[PDB]
């Protein structure tokens, strides 16, 4: 039941296509 | 966090754009 | 560990795995 | 430059941890 | 609990390897 | 749909082939 | 948005994200 | 030709939406 | 509810970055 | 079926799909 | 198996290394 | 050599099943 972990993989991928050359910071917990 | 905001409900490309730089 | 030029999508998924909990920042200045 | 470092060159698990938080 | 969305990513990937040059149409809902 | 047919149960490469062109 | 030549697997996952609900068609005529 | 268009050239979020349904 | 199957995709990916040139054997069930 | 040079990450995910239950072995001797 | 050991709980890069060759 | 076979050459679904268990 490690859902959240599998989901993080898809987010960064998405963040990568969306931000492009602007880049981003990935920080799971606040 | 974004994990809680997008791994529970589906964010859109527009929602994901807030997290960029 | 892998010995190869990691690029775009692969590069990001790899940062994701290593940093795990810590998180990471991605800024393609080239 | 991580791109120049890890995509234009070789990157060990360690040269990759530098870009973590 | 956005399972279905994560699953769609893996399907198209699979559809891509399987169909090859024949291609395909992805339509979630009928 | 295929979402309902393959995201609930595991389709095979042969089952996935029906959805091609 | 990303500025780079998107190919094969990457190209498909990208169409998947943009179109989302609408869906898409993939036909590699080249 | 999406391949010639998005893989053999550059593709903005818009030249990519054309291939949607 | 084909979770396990989606998870296997991410494992082999991870196994691939971790093992590198050493390679590995993937065997789901014992 | 796909007709293209399958490399690294793509090569592994592809072995994963074909072999499925059987499993597979990955050893990059080149 | 590894499926049971890593798909229920999150394995680490160090845990995953046991499964190599 | 699967790399030489499937990445340095073309690989059909069959030349790929050989590397299964
Ligand atoms: Cl997943
Ligand atoms: Cl690639
Ligand atoms: Zn996934
Ligand atoms: Zn790739």
Curated annotation (Swiss-Prot), chains B, D, F, H, K, L:
Disulfide bonds join 6-11. It comes from the Eukaryota. This is Insulin A chain. The lineage of its organism: Eukaryota, Metazoa, Chordata, Craniata, Vertebrata. The chain holds residues 90 to 110 of 110 of the full protein.
